[PDB]
Amino acid sequence: SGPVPSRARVYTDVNTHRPREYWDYESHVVEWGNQDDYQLVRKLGRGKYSEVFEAINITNNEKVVVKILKPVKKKKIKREIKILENLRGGPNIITLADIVKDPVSRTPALVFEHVNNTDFKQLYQTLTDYDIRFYMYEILKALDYCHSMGIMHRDVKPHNVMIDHEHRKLRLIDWGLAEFYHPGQEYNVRVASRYFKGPELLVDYQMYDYSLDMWSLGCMLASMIFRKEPFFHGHDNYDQLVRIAKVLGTEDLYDYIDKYNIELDPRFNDILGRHSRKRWERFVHSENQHLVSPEALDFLDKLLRYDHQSRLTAREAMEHPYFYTVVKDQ
Numbered sequence: 001s002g003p004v005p006s007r008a009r010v011y012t013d014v015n016t017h018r019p020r021e022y023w024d025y026e027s028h029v030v031e032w033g034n035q036d037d038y039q040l041v042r043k044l045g046r047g048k049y050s051e052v053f054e055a056i057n058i059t060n061n062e063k064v065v066v067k068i069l070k071p072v073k074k075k076k077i078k079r080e081i082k083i084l085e086n087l088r089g090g091p092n093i094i095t096l097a098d099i100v101k102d103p104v105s106r107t108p109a110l111v112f113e114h115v116n117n118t119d120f121k122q123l124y125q126t127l128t129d130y131d132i133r134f135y136m137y138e139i140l141k142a143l144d145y146c147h148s149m150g151i152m153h154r155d156v157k158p159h160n161v162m163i164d165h166e167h168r169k170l171r172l173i174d175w176g177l178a179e180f181y182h183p184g185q186e187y188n189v190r191v192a193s194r195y196f197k198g199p200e201l202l203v204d205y206q207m208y209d210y211s212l213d214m215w216s217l218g219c220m221l222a223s224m225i226f227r228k229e230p231f232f233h234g235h236d237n238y239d240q241l242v243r244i245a246k247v248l249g250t251e252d253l254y255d256y257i258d259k260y261n262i263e264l265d266p267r268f269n270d271i272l273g274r275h276s277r278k279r280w281e282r283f284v285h286s287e288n289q290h291l292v293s294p295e296a297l298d299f300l301d302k303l304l305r306y307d308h309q310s311r312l313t314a315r316e317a318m319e320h321p322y323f324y325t326v327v328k329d330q
């Protein structure tokens with residue numbers, strides 16, 4: 001018959017109450033900055049969608065980060081820029097400072113406020129129980145804010161959360177896959193990085209929402225408290241669902257496909273099998289026990305649900321007992 005429709009439980013209609021200019025990004029007019037304003041210092045990183053540099057703004061001597069965009073549909077560039085503008089000033093959202101035309105690629109180059117990251121490959125190895133709660137709490141601020149502003153990030157993962165540890169400062173970056181949420185919309189499921197993909201994406205359920213970001217956040221949390229990064233390490237999108245199903249169980253998976261009347265890809269038949277839902281204690285060992293508590297597990301559990309409608313909202317997440325001590329010190 002066709003899948004059963006779905007709606008975000010919170011912030012459902014925020015965009016519909018906005019001026020259409022707010023979410024109708026195809027009509028956004030970019031006003032360029034001056035590209036002689038910025039001199040590239042060095043290359044920071046290379047991605048699928050861009051190359052990232054450190055630069056100097058020579059007008060005022062400030063350090064900035066410059067993201068030179070690889071060729072992509074102009075619609076996608078307008079979308080990212082409109083999102084960054086709408087979210088600018090929000091808590092723990094990276095600040096877009098300027099937009100220029102790179103003299104070389106002739107593509108757009110986005111200029112952001114500088115940040116001084118400790119790459120997560122060295123950081124997560126050193127994080128205390130307390131730091132994990134503190135940093136999780138700061139991410140939830142960014143996600144509740146962007147959710148409330150009608151936007152889903154759709155690529156939550158360790159690379160996209162910059163932490164200046166020395167200053168206890170966090171920024172959620174890379175809004176290039178972010179989208180405006182509209183009730184009844186069917187989205188592309190080919191978003192997010194494989195290990196952070198929600199079940200909705202893996203079984204091709206298109207009518208998803210903000211709650212996608214909460215599953216991703218759950219994957220990050222799992223890898224920090226168990227010290228296994230990435231946590232669900234699949235080889236492809238098929239094997240990714242199988243790795244999840246080995247932990248969350250198959251009974252809940254099939255109740256979820258039955259509930260939304262999802263057409264499961266024939267390819268999943270012989271690979272999924274039958275799997276009991278595991279107790280989190282099986283991932284606890286001597287090297288990670290100091291990071292795992294009854295609170296951490298209750299919280300993780302409430303994020304990692306197949307049924308996207310069942311997961312905590314970012315705001316519910318923030319009232320969880322896991323964060324009592326960080327809410328107090330703040």
Ligand SMILES: Cc1cc(O)c2c(c1)C(=O)c1cc(O)cc(O)c1C2=O
Pocket residue numbers: 044045046052065067094112113115117173174175176
């Ligand atoms: C290795 C690396 C260092 C960085 O400082 C950034 C990035 C990558 C990065 O990908 C990035 C994306 C973005 O959308 C905004 C940013 O400020 C950034 C960055 O600031």
